[PDB]
Each structure stands twice: as structure tokens, then as C-alpha cells.
Amino acid sequence: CPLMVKVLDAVRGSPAINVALHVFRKAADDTWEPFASGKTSESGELHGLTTEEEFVEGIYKVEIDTKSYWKALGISPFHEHAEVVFTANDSGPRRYTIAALLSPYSYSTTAVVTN
Amino acid sequence: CPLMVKVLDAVRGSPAINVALHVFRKAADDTWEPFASGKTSESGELHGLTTEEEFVEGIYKVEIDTKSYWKALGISPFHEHAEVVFTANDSGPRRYTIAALLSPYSYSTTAVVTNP
Amino acid sequence: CPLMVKVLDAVRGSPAINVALHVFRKAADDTWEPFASGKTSESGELHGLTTEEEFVEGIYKVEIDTKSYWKALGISPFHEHAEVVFTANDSGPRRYTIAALLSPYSYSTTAVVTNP
Amino acid sequence: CPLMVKVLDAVRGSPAINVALHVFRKAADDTWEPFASGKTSESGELHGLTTEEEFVEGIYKVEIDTKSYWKALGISPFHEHAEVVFTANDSGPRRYTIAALLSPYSYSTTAVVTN
Ligand SMILES: [Mg+2]
Ligand SMILES: [Mg+2]
Ligand SMILES: [Mg+2]
Ligand SMILES: [Mg+2]
């Protein structure tokens, strides 16, 4: 599992469940091309997006549909979505966890990159 | 001043100075059109991006060039940029402050929205 | 203004207004002595807590009463308060801005430290 | 495991390893009394602080020695420590995860309370 996403809800103090997200890879076109997607689990996590062989160096975008999440809860949100854009880099074995902490008018994202 | 951006450096505990940022607005054909750009001052702020008359209803994207900021300080950061995407003014004009707090492998962004 | 506090509400996207906070300074016997207190304004800021002459070197604690803030808005939050503990002025006088960003089960705090 | 702590390093993008923390319980004295302590693991986590029987309702303080962590890395920090103060509340089965995200001049803490 070279790439995992974890989403937390700062209003309810809970995993953010059933959050849709899409992963894109930058093409030589300089355009965003679909790569993988899913919905977070009851633990707010999404595993199995890609494989070591598929997840080569390049620029990736993770788009988290925060707006639909807050709309489901009946809370007016600010952002259309949360986006995390980064270069995947081979430097020994690397696993990427993208963590996101959601509030209606604020979000934070952190990368935990381990070996 | 309907749109202002403030950027802070969480490593140094300081304004994030000379940070480039670009604002885009979604066009009717769903592409991102350039809207405004600038760089943060000594106070980490960018004022004067637009006017009440120009800042019409729409979907806007603020792209903050965090990578160049960290690189110039000797740091190889995680993110290519921080980008903030939001619908503006769809209930009438508002004043928007976009705040960003930067660390090499993390950032947070908050919006303060006020009624003039 | 050597010490200022700014508090934001991440649920509403607004200043956190009328937030009570108390500042303490560690005494020579390691107890927390009252130092200053006040409440945030309509802009979410609290100015005038102290002066350059009174704000001597020491270990300071800012206790922000986040629980009463959320409760008055109908929300039962996680934290009793947010507290910020730091050594001040031990390399000479500095100006400190303590920023807090509040959500019911989360908060963040950042310091902006500048040389007068 | 009714109470777990997880600490992340936003400068290095990694678990915050070997971070000392102390847990205190408020006494009727209105004073802070030692309850449990430990150091975060290589995954930035600290488990086994208490038990369901011991972790009764009351006010708890988690003090995270962020200053010593940053000093070990040679980075000047702002805070003496990070403190998380909360009331533990019986409302069906509840497990508490205190998560902390550390930067030298900034930290965030979030509570994930699950059933
Ligand atoms: Mg290479
Ligand atoms: Mg309309
Ligand atoms: Mg001295
Ligand atoms: Mg009860």
C-alpha cells in the first residue's frame, strides 16, 4: 500500500466516513488524468488506491470532496474541495499517508512519508 | 478589499514573505481563467488583488506557491503548492480573508468571511 | 503592544468574538501567578494585555476559554480550554502574536514573533 | 485501550518518535496529579496508558514535551510543551485518540472519539 489517505472530522471528533476522493496524475500534456479513487471507510481511511509498480515518480493530485461531506451533515462549507498536490519521489522505499483534518471553513493536510 | 491573503511560516514563527500566488476564476466552459496574482509583503499579506466590481460571483482558486518558498529557505517540501478553491459572492458581496499556515510537510488554510 | 491574541472560528469562518482568556506568569516558586486577562473583540483580537516594561522575561501561559465559547453557541466541545505555554523575551524584548483556530474537537495555535 | 496518543512531525513528514508525555488527572484539590506517562513509539503512538476500569470520568491533562523533541532535532521551538485538557465522559463505549501535529512555532491537536 504505497499511498493511503486518512480523513478526520474536527466538528464531530470522528473519522470522516464516506468521503469521496479522486487521485490524478499529471500528464506530459500538463493536464490531470484520472489515476484512482474511492470513498473513505468507517475508519476514515482509503487503502488500496495503487500498487508499488503503478505508483511511479510524477506529480499527483488528491481531490477530497469535502463539500459533499459537509452538505450531507447539513453544515455550510467554504471550500469546493480539498486538494493535495505533490511529487512522488523514489528515495529508498517510501510509503505515503495523506492525512486531512476537516472543518467547515478550514482544513489542514499533512504528509507522513515512511520507509 | 474584498479578497486578501495572509501566509504564515510555522517553522520560523513569522510572516511568510515574498510568497507568490495566483488567483483563477472558473469560466463558463469549466476552464480556469487567470484572475489576479501577486506576492506577499513583509507582513505576509497580499492586498489589492481585486475590487468589489470585478470580484463577481463565481468559483475561484487561489494557488499559493509554497514549494518555491521552502526551496529558497533550503528546504525540500512535500507539496507542490497549496490551493484554495471556493465559491464566492453567491449570496451577495462578501469580504474574504484566505489564511495559510505553512510547514514543510503540512499546511492549513482557513477562510474568514465577513459581510460589508 | 508586545502581546496580542487572535482567535478564529473554523466552523463559521469568522473571528471568535467574546472569548475569555487569562494570562499567567510562572513565579520563582514555580506557581502560576495571574498576569493579565481580557476578552476578544468583534475582530477576534485582544490588544493591550501588557506593556514592554511589565512584560519581562519569563514563562507565560495563555489560557483561552474555548469551552464557554462553544457552549454559548450550542456545542459541547472536547477541550476544556486551549492553553499556550512559552518562554518570552529571553533574548531581549519581542512582540508576540498568539493565534488560535478553533473547532469543537480540534484547535491549532501558532505564534508570530517579531523583533521591534 | 481507552486512551491513545499519536504525534506527527510536520517539518519532517514523519511520526514524532520518542516524544515524552505525561497524563494527569484533576484532583478534588483542583491540582494536577500524575496518572500515566510514556514515550511515543517509532510510529509516533503511545498505547496502554490506562484501562477501562481506571479511566473514569473526570478532567484529564495530556502534556506533550514538544520542546525536548525540537531541541533534539536542533530546531528552536516556541512552546514549552503542548497541553490537551478535556473531560472524559461516559456516553456509551468511548475510546479517545489524542492526535497532535507539531511544528516549531505551531501545533494542532484533535480528538477522535469512537465507539
Ligand atoms: Mg530522482
Ligand atoms: Mg444566485
Ligand atoms: Mg538571560
Ligand atoms: Mg454524566
Swiss-Prot record, chains B, C:
Effect of residue 60 to H: In AMYLD1; leptomeningeal amyloidosis; vitreous amyloid in some patients
Effect ascribed to mutating residue 9 to G: In AMYLD1; leptomeningeal amyloidosis; leads to unfolding and exposure of N-89 to glycosylation by STT3B and subsequent degradation by the ERAD pathway
Location of 4-carboxyglutamate modifications: 33
GO molecular function, a single term: molecular sequestering activity
An individual GO BP term: negative regulation of glomerular filtration
Subunit structure: Homotetramer. Dimer of dimers. In the homotetramer, subunits assemble around a central channel that can accommodate two ligand molecules. Interacts with RBP4.
Protein's UniProt name: Transthyretin
Full-protein interval shown: 30 to 145 of 147
